[PDB]
Structure formats: C-alpha cells, structure tokens
Design a protein around this ligand. Structure first.
Ligand code: CYC
Ligand code: CYC
Ligand code: MG
Ligand code: MG
Lengths: 162, 162
C-alpha cells in the first residue's frame, strides 16, 4: 500500500508544498536501483517453483520431524507439503511485490502484519520460514545490485520473523 | 494512491499471482522514462516562482480586463494578483507531483476532481489557466523526453480545462 513516492506526494499535498530536495533525492535513488530490482523480480518469478521446492526441502532436512510426525501443522501427508510450498510462495510473491515497488510496503502490509499471530495460531515455527528464506537467498543466482535488492528484502522478511 | 506500480501490484495480489509479463512491461515503461520525468520535475520545482510570475503576467496581457476590474473575481489589487499566483502554483505543484509519480494520478486526485466546480463557483475563467499553462509549456526550457514528459502533463491539465 505504501510506496516512497506516494507517501512523499501525500505529505506534500497536505502541507501544500513542493517536494523537498531530500525527498527528490530519495525518489531518484529509488529510480536508480529500479532496473536491478526489476531484474531481481524477474529472476525470482521465473525460478519460483524451483526455489520453492528447494526451500521446502531445506526446511524438511533441517527439521526432520516435520516430515515424520502426523498432525495438521506438519507435512507428513501431501496436503501438508502443499501447504508448506504455498506458504513459501506467499513469502516469495510478496518479496517480488516489494522489489517491484522498491520498498517494504507490500511486505509490511500483506505479510509482516500479524505474522507472529498467524504462526502461533496454527502452530507454525518461524525458524522453518527463516531457513526457507536463507535457502532462497543463497540460491537466487543473482549478481550485483539485483542481488543487493533481493537480499535486502529477504533479510527484511527474516528479521520480521526474528 | 494510484500509480502504474500500485496498479500492477494490486491486480497481481487480488488474484494471488505474480506480476504478469504485460504488467512487468508497463512498469519497465514507467522506469525507462523516470529519468526524464525527474529531470522535468526538478527543473519546474527549482524555477517555480519565475514560471508562476511569467504565467500570471501572460494571463494579464492576454486578458487585460483582469487587471483593470474591481471585484474579488479579478486582479486589480494586490490580493487578486496574489491569489492568481497561488492558483498557478497549485497547477505547477500538482504537475510536478504527476511527473514524479509517472502518471496522471496526482493531477486527477488533487486538481481535476472538482475543478469545473471550483472555476464556476468562484467565476474563474478556465482560459486564464489555459494561457498560464501555455506560458509554462513554452518557457520550461526542457529538452528531449524531459520536455515530452512535462508537455504531456501540461496538455493533460489543458485538456481538463477545455
Ligand atoms: C512449510 C514451511 C511448513 C508448514 C506449512 C503449513 N501451513 C499450514 C497452514 C497455514 N500457513 C499460513 C501462512 C500464511 N497465510 C497468509 O496469508 C500469510 C501472509 C502472506 C502467511 C504467512 C496460514 C494462515 C495457515 C492456516 C490456514 C491454511 O491452512 O490455509 C499447514 C497445515 C496446518 C493445519 O492446521 O492445517 C502447514 C503444513 N508446516 C510444516 O511442517 C512445513 C515445514
Ligand atoms: C489568476 C490566474 C486569476 C484569478 C485568481 C483568483 N483566485 C481567487 C480564488 C480561488 N482560486 C481557486 C482554485 C483552486 N483552489 C484549489 O485548491 C485548487 C486545486 C489545487 C484550485 C484549482 C479557489 C478554490 C478559489 C476560492 C478560494 C479562495 O479565495 O482562496 C480569486 C479571488 C476570488 C474570490 O471571489 O475570492 C482570484 C482573483 N482571477 C483573476 O482575475 C486572475 C487572472
Ligand atoms: Mg504479536
Ligand atoms: Mg469542461
């Protein structure tokens, strides 16, 4: 919901002022990293299923009980594994949203808001998703500024879980 | 607020999907003009007072009665001239907003919505502001796409007054 440009423009219109030079430089900085953020979003989108399966398997190997113990919260049956892949897809989709927007707005609204309440209500462990995000970070195949932006948002999500 | 970025993000989030390649291309089309848009907005912001004064003067020369009439409607005293400069400042400010946002969103939300109502209630002639915008378009001193951006938001405002 929140992007840098929109917040700046709304505040300026409330005050009835032109945008300050600091605001202009912030928006210019967002635009200067926009091509790398676009490359990062394209990489994450085109390799989404491979990254999701790798991350889910990494969780399964770091937390083996999740594949052995019966119960709704775990991934013993195919339903639980599908739910796990779906959760990781949630994270990756909102990460691409934040990359496209060039800010933490999408992650703050669609994911982080109440995240701990969600994980505790359905007995989900945050370390699972931390490890899945570590896997996605270490396997996105990005280089340069695109890797920097992708890592920025992945680390943001990780910190939200931490 | 509605920009070409938030549009694609909302259209992708409501369906629980990633951004389509068409949406990616629209976002990249905004990005490939962001540089010229920022150049135009910076130029118009830095030379705002001179442009406002020149546009007000051009309005006074094209419509001389506006400087010779009594009544709150017109600008014979200093109060009316100050109000006219303030109106032109509104126009230029919202135009810079639309430049920074890369779309007609800010112009639609802050200016055009109710503009006919404003100009009719207080008996302000839209041709005045049309001539002021013509002066701005002829005297912004921009080149290349930076002009093409500025012009495309001037004419828009002009089209909203016709
Ligand atoms: C995979 C890493 C591990 C795992 C996954 C799992 N989840 C459920 C249920 C849910 N997961 C969520 C998460 C979200 N929904 C959102 O909108 C957002 C923000 C974008 C998040 C983070 C939710 C809400 C649920 C409950 C609702 C639902 O099931 O759709 C299950 C099944 C639990 C159950 O009680 O049925 C599983 C298995 N569990 C593991 O063991 C994997 C390692
Ligand atoms: C100057 C080009 C000509 C002109 C100016 C003039 N304006 C007023 C007062 C008003 N101008 C507006 C326009 C807007 N207010 C907004 O918020 C927006 C959108 C951002 C716009 C476009 C309005 C609403 C008013 C009335 C409110 C106010 O007075 O502050 C006057 C005085 C009119 C009166 O009766 O008080 C004048 C003179 N008139 C000319 O002759 C100039 C050529
Ligand atoms: Mg809490
Ligand atoms: Mg009309």
């Amino acid at each position: 919901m929140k992007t840098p440009i929109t917040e700046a423009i709304a505040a300026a219109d409330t005050q009835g002022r032109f945008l300050s030079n600091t605001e202009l430089q912030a928006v210019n900085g967002r635009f200067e990293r926009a091509a790398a953020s676009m490359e990062a979003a394209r990489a994450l989108t085109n390799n989404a299923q491979q990254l999701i399966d790798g991350a889910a398997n990494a969780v399964y190997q770091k937390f083996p009980y999740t594949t052995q113990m019966q119960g709704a919260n775990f991934a013993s049956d195919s339903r639980g594994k599908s739910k796990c892949a779906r959760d990781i897809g949630y994270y990756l989709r909102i990460i691409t949203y934040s990359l496209v927007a060039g800010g933490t707005g999408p992650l703050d609204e669609y994911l982080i808001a109440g995240l701990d309440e969600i994980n505790r209500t359905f007995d989900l462990s945050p370390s699972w998703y931390v490890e899945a995000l570590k896997y996605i970070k270490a396997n996105h195949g990005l280089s340069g500024q695109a890797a920097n932006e992708a890592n920025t948002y992945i680390d943001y999500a990780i910190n939200a879980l931490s």
